Design a protein around this ligand. Structure first.
Ligand SMILES: C[C@@H](Nc1ccc2c(c1)OCCn1cc(N3C(=O)OC[C@H]3C(F)F)nc1-2)C(N)=O
Ligand SMILES: [Cl-]
Lengths: 255, 1031
């Protein structure tokens, strides 16, 4: 009656995680009397029910099978081709493979290791949540500095247009004041151009300093992204191990 | 790009009292004028031209009136400042400088585009720079909806203009439930008609005993009749006088801008229905029509510049192509991974139809991190003609960490989705460069089908190149007439009453919840009986999942059935718009159902989800976006929250373009309300900046020092002008007048929220509420609280219609930015910890506190209200699974109304952190709450009050279990929002376990009482009448 492909009372959430990113042919049986098969076909978890009536099993009437084990072994060798789906039962997910995660035999040693994995998972989750906050604020600050660089470009363009404007007017009047003999006025137009040119140098230096900070923050963002992509596989594996130790204490207990 | 922060200058939160502004004159000169922080541009201009005479070449300068200032704003825009009455600090300058030029171009259009841009949060000119044809066509084509709504707004003017600005806040049905009708004295309602009477302008009042089903004109008619009884007027003379006051006066809710304009029964209005339930006498005011219409200006819609510009810009059908689908992955620019930890990288691809993959996923060959080169044609198990209209390509650069050897862990790095068919029904062809997005937080799946389509605007991200097939022709999707021809042939090759057992099986499938396990045999049964499903139209969402979307024969036959499908309820139609149903004909049918049957009450109620649903749509131009914008421009109450729901997510770059373009169309056609919304946006920007200073600059400072800084900054005229005389964003009917700075304070709650108090400037404020208090908070994301409080209101509405007075308090909550939002203050409310601290404390402290506040006859009403409200929250919190309750997050009003605050999280959020599968009871009914319900008793559970409370809980539990399909779809429509608690369909399965949908109705009652007995250690008990349910 019991088999590696038969899992028993399993929720729909766990069924989807076993068949996640699997080839066509993977399947599992679970209690709904009746039992529900879940075969993979075109990246979808197709649910095929097995009816029971007077000691007979099958997907649809007529019921030409004596037991559930006979129905599974028949379609494992022969292809389905009842519905018009050209696929067959090939890769059965096993229960004994999950048991190798929890290597301890006594109940006390399982609980001792669970306390260690749960403490490690809390520390790794706290590290991942703080690194995600660093990743988010760095991304926002880079976007803020990128917008500021664009604003500095338009700011410089206006002050450069002001220099070009002064150059256009000054060339007509410089001859007028020189021929008149007003050197005091000529020095004022020249001083105002030097004042405007000095401010242009200060705005260009401000943009150059923020370009260096943006380059530095982009390198920091790349290192935070590298650390985020390295901690995720370790965090999900450490969480899956913890879940197996919790399921071991549930099955080895009063129910 | 949008503004970085609400500061006054780049890298500076507040300007000092005096600041040097580098003014640039048109004669090429530069003047460094010392300007005050809160000085107007007219004063700065006047002082600048006085100093300009001292500088050289002053003779070439013209009169100061013929010039306006222009400068670079924080959004990298060269904004022209036409409105010279604005203060220097409120201009959002990048650097302290102001260029002086003559006004050029269309002044009216540039002012309007500045107003539109300020409301959006980004410049309008950036949309003109977008080369994508879909974006330019969306701006041009959506203008027909804009003028369609504006034409009807000025058709029956001035009445139609008032209907838009102040729409009638009414319920979805005029029928009243059993408990509401019994409260009315023999089908009648008592109401006080307050009025400011000329010449002295005094506040007069008079009682009215009228029928509840009277329309607003019939209320006016009976008010004149009672007043003219002493005068003894004739029947015809009275009837003629009534017609004059009806046509020259209209009713208004005292204390708020809510009017009774349309002919609806008086009891159908929300203010009246609430007054009957609470047992309060309504207070109305006969405002003169002339006074209301004079304040409402005419809204004009000028066609935009981009609409009046000249346009910038063989065919083969899809069913003619006889080859299979293949997509080549060429190269990626860069990948952010560690070489020492990550072994190799590969692009995982998949063809999807919303959520379900149309074919098996095909991956590229594994290549190293340093050399991301593939140039591989990936063959998918799908025939090109069989691809549906909503076919999409989902891809992501995945990693592999084969360090353990036995188990190789794969994780995503950057994702990107492409619509296989563009907005003009053309199949994609040639080369395409796609910039990828970061992986959302918590997403462990290697592909993100729920995510938005299109390239990432931030080009400093991984760029993957692709090359689609080219059959020497432009491939287009077939027409509806071509699709209908193939459907008739499919039916003809296959070729009256149906058996009762088959009809009962179909009935049972339709009543099942959206995420119920649909069997393959059931799918064949539904597809075979596809034509018989017209008699029971509610089974359409179940039938559509059974349709093989990767086959043109079954798709074409379904298209004909959708075309002539009977109409369905608006709640059922919302199901067909989530991520699972992306087909345009399915979505079009659902929008058509909402156009005819969805009322303005339900549209406002489920507006949060309908705005999020726009993100699942493949294209910018669609029937849903046209329907929602049409309703936003014809109703200001819908339009106000529609604006704020889109504004809040503008920071998110995945929706910035879609929401920004939609906000541009809304702001251009809303009219007068754009100026009111700008006043709200400017007030919220000052509050963001004020809180940012208290968190970064005054971080390590005392409360006394922070309060001194808070008052000093608020007392300045720039802050007073912006935060006084504007409409409340939590409710547009309520308005905020002068601030009460003595009552404002920094709260001791998480993220130091700012308490704000405004005087209600309404002439009749004393009758509804004088103080409009709102808690502004910047730090935590209040999108979860918005969804929880919205669902509590829907639960309350369902219970009220069934005949249950479980008075819930869904207080106002609205997210307005990146972790920025507003919370409505409940007047005369205190936490359990605050009540216990007044008094060491005993279990009877909460009951003794209620005895002191409610004395005499109002004691029984307080205990009843406490029990009614407590029963509602005990059921609502259990079903949703909110964060664990404690004394500091449970509040009780003076009259006894119990309510919950600070939800934060919902569903099995703590399951991924701890790993314990258990449906918790968040609101534990401790002895403190049981003593109040039982009116002071030692044996609290063995009382008639607790037995009535138990019945109240089982009634509300089954009420939500009956309408469970609505709540499952409301959560399913919020998956794309990007919230950590709701991302995959496995998170929604928590409410299925609490509502016990797989089990029978009797088993659900036995389950609910067992969950309460485990948390409260006994008390709840079974009944013999539970066995008689239909199973
Ligand atoms: C002053 C007086 N009145 C008061 C106090 C707090 C709230 C309130 C009224 O109105 C009821 C809605 N409300 C919601 C929240 N909050 C939330 O939901 O999150 C945390 C927290 C606030 F800080 F945001 N806080 C309130 C008192 N009891 O101390
Ligand atoms: Cl970036």
């Amino acid at each position: 009656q019991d088999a590696e492909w038969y899992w028993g009372d399993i929720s729909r959430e766990e069924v989807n995680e076993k068949l996640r990113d699997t080839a066509d042919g993977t399947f599992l049986v679970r209690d709904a009397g009746d039992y529900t098969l879940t075969l993979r076909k075109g990246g979808n978890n197709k649910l095929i029910k097995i009816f029971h009536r007077d000691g007979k099993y099958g997907f649809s009437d007529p019921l030409t099978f004596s037991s559930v084990v006979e129905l599974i072994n028949h379609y494992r060798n022969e292809s389905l081709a009842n519905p018009k789906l050209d696929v067959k039962l090939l890769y059965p997910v096993s229960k004994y493979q999950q048991d190798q995660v929890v290597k301890e035999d006594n109940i006390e040693a399982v609980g001792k290791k669970l306390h260690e994995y749960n403490t490690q998972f809390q520390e790794k989750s706290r590290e991942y949540d703080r690194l995600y906050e660093e990743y988010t604020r760095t991304s926002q600050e880079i976007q803020m500095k990128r917008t500021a660089i664009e604003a500095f470009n338009e700011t410089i363009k206006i002050f450069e247009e002001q220099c070009q404007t002064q150059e256009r007017y000054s060339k007509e009047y410089i001859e007028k004041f020189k021929r008149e003999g007003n050197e005091k006025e000529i020095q004022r137009i020249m001083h105002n151009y030097d004042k405007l040119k000095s401010r242009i140098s200060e705005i260009i230096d401000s943009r150059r300093r923020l370009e260096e900070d943006l380059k530095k923050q982009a390198a920091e963002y790349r290192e935070i992204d590298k650390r985020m992509n390295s901690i995720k596989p370790d965090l999900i594996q450490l969480r899956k191990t913890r879940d197996q130790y919790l399921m071991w204490l549930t099955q080895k207990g009063v129910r | 790009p949008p503004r970085p922060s609400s500061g006054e200058l780049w890298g500076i939160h507040l300007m000092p009292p005096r600041i040097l502004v580098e003014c640039l004159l048109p004669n090429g000169m530069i003047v460094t004028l010392e300007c005050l922080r809160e000085a107007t541009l007219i004063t700065i201009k006047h002082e600048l031209f006085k100093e300009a005479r001292k500088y050289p070449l002053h003779q070439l300068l013209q009169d100061e009136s013929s010039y306006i200032f222009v400068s670079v704003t924080q959004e990298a825009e060269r904004e022209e400042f036409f409105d010279e009455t604005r203060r220097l600090c409120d201009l959002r300058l990048f650097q302290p400088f102001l260029k002086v030029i003559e006004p050029v171009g269309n002044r009216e259009e540039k002012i309007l585009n500045r107003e539109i841009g300020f409301a959006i949060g980004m410049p309008v000119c950036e949309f003109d720079m977008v080369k994508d044809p879909e974006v330019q066509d969306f701006r041009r084509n959506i203008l027909n909806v804009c003028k369609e709504a504006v034409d009807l707004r000025d058709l029956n003017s001035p009445h139609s203009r008032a209907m838009y600005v102040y729409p009638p806040n009414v319920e979805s049905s005029p029928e009243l439930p059993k408990h509401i009708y019994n409260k009315l004295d023999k089908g009648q309602i008592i109401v006080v008609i307050w009025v400011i009477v000329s010449p002295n302008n005094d506040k007069q009042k008079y009682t009215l005993k009228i029928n509840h089903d009277c329309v607003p004109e019939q209320v006016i008619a009976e008010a004149i009749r009672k007043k003219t009884r002493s005068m003894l007027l004739s029947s015809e003379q009275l009837k003629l006088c009534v017609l004059e006051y009806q046509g020259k006066y209209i009713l208004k809710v005292c204390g708020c801008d809510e009017y009774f304009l349309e002919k609806y029964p008086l009891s159908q209005y929300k203010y009246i229905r609430s007054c009957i339930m609470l047992g309060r006498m309504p207070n109305l005011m006969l405002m003169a029509k002339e006074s209301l219409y004079s304040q409402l200006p005419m809204d004009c819609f000028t066609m935009p510049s981009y609409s009046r510009r000249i346009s910038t810009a063989s065919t083969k059908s899809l069913w003619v192509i006889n080859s299979a689908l293949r997509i080549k992955i060429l190269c990626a620019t860069y990948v952010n991974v560690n070489i020492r930890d990550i072994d190799k990288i590969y692009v995982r691809t998949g063809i999807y139809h919303g959520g379900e993959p149309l074919c098996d996923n095909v991956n590229t060959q594994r290549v190293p991190c340093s050399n991301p080169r593939w140039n591989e044609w990936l063959n998918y198990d799908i025939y090109i003609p069989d691809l549906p209209r909503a076919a999409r390509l989902c891809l992501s650069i995945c990693s592999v960490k084969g360090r353990k050897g036995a188990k190789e862990e794969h994780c995503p790095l950057a994702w990107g989705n492409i619509n296989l068919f563009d907005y003009t029904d053309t199949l994609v062809s040639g080369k395409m460069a796609l910039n990828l997005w970061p992986v959302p937080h918590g997403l462990e799946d290697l592909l993100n089908p729920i995510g938005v389509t299109g390239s990432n605007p931030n080009k400093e991200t991984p760029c993957l190149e692709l090359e689609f097939d080219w059959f020497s022709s432009v491939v287009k999707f077939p027409d509806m007439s071509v699709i209908e021809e193939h459907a008739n042939w499919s039916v003809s090759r296959e070729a009256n009453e149906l058996r009762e057992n088959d009809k009962e099986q179909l009935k049972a499938i339709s009543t099942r919840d959206p995420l119920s396990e649909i069997t393959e045999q059931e799918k064949d049964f539904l597809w075979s009986h596809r034509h018989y499903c017209v008699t029971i139209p509610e089974i359409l969402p179940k039938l559509l999942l059974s349709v093989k979307w990767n086959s043109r024969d079954e798709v074409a036959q379904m298209y004909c059935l959708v075309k002539d499908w009977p109409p369905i309820k608006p709640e059922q139609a919302m199901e067909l718009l989530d991520c699972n149903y992306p087909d345009p004909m399915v979505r079009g049918f659902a929008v058509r159902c909402l156009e005819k049957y969805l009322t303005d009450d339900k549209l406002s109620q489920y507006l949060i989800q309908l705005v999020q649903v726009l993100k699942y749509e493949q294209y910018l131009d669609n029937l849903l976006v046209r329907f929602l914008l049409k309703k936003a421009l014809t109703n200001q109450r819908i339009g106000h929250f529609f604006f704020w729901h889109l504004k809040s997510e503008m920071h998110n770059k995945t929706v910035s373009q879609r929401f920004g373009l939609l906000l541009e169309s809304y702001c251009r056609a809303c009219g007068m309300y754009l100026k009111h919304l700008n006043r709200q946006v400017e007030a919220m920007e000052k509050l963001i900046n004020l809180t940012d200073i208290l968190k970064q600059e005054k971080k390590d400072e005392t409360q006394k020092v922070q309060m001194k800084f808070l008052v000093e900054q608020m007392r300045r005229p720039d802050f007073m002008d912006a935060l006084q005389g504007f409409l409340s964003p939590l409710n547009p009917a309520h308005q905020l007048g002068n601030l009460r700075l003595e009552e404002c304070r920094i709260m001791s709650s998480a993220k130091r929220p700012l308490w704000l108090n405004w005087e209600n400037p309404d002439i009749m404020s004393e009758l509804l509420f004088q103080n409009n208090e709102i808690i502004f908070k910047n730090g935590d994301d209040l999108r979860q609280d918005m969804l929880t409080l919205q669902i509590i209101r829907i639960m309350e509405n369902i219970w009220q219609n069934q005949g249950l007075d479980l008075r819930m308090l869904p207080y106002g909550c609205l997210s307005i930015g990146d972790c920025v939002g507003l919370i409505e203050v409940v007047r005369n409310s205190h936490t359990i910890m605050q009540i216990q601290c007044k008094g060491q404390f005993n279990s009877h402290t909460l009951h003794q506190w209620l005895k002191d506040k409610n004395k005499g006859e109002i004691y029984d009403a307080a205990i009843d209200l406490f029990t009614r409200s407590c029963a509602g929250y005990c059921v609502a919190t259990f079903i949703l699974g909110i964060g664990d309750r404690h004394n500091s997050n449970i509040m009780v009003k003076d009259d006894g109304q119990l309510f919950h605050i600070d939800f934060g999280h919902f569903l099995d959020h703590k399951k991924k952190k701890f790993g314990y599968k258990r449906e918790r009871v968040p609101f534990v009914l401790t002895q403190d709450f049981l003593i109040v319900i039982s009116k002071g008793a030692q044996e609290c559970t063995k009382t008639r009050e607790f037995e009535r409370f138990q019945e109240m809980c089982y009634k509300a539990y089954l009420a939500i279990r009956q309408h469970a399909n609505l709540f499952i779809n409301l959560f399913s429509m919020m998956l794309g929002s990007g919230m950590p608690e709701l991302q995959s369909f496995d998170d929604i399965a928590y409410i299925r376990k609490t509502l016990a949908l797989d089990k029978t109705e009797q088993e659900a009652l036995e389950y609910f009482m067992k969950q309460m007995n485990d948390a409260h250690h006994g008390g709840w008990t079974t009944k013999m009448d539970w066995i008689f349910h239909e199973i």
